Amino acid sequence: GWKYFKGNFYYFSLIPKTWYSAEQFCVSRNSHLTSVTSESEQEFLYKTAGGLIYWIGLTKAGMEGDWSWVDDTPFNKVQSARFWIPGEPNNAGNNEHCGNIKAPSLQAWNDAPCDKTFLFICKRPYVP
């Protein structure tokens, strides 16, 4: 059921999980919760999500609580500013340390509690 886009395969889950149980599921399938590194990848993802919320690989790291990607893609704060929903990350209830795709827009991301269950998206490299 994996979808192909620019050198990577993507799995849009049918069952919801917490952010970490989701990441574990991806890791069991030789993948990670997806990073997003271009406007065209953001577009591919939110369009495919069809208006439902999906965990992606956004999570906090370091003392300062900077956002990071679980697949170890360096997080580019400047290049990613345009990808959040206006007002996000707002850190609601001071407990929103993971990120999902929420709005069908280039401005798509929301921070939500890691322990909430959502559908999720895995990303796996194609290696010829």
Ligand X SMILES: CO[C@H]1O[C@H](CO)[C@@H](O)[C@H](O)[C@H]1NC(C)=O
Give contact residues for Ca ion (rule: CB under 5 A).
Answer: 88, 90, 92, 96, 110-111
Q: 10 Å Cβ neighbour count for 70?
A: 21
Which is closer to Ca ion, CB of 30 or CB of 91? 91
The partner in contact with residue 70, picked from Ca ion, ligand X, none with C-beta cut-offs of 5 to 8 angstroms by kind, is: none
Closest CA to 70 of 99, 103, 113: 99
C-beta closer to ligand X: residue 23 or 111: 111
Positions in 72-101 near ligand X (CB under 6 A): 88, 90, 92, 96
CB nearer ligand X, residue 41 or residue 96: 96
Distance CA 55, CA 77 (A): 19
Task: Say if residues 34 and 123 touch (Cβ distance below 8 Å).
Answer: yes
C-alpha 96: how far from chain center? 14
Can you give the binding site for ligand X, defined by CB under 6 A? 88, 90, 92, 96, 110-112, 116
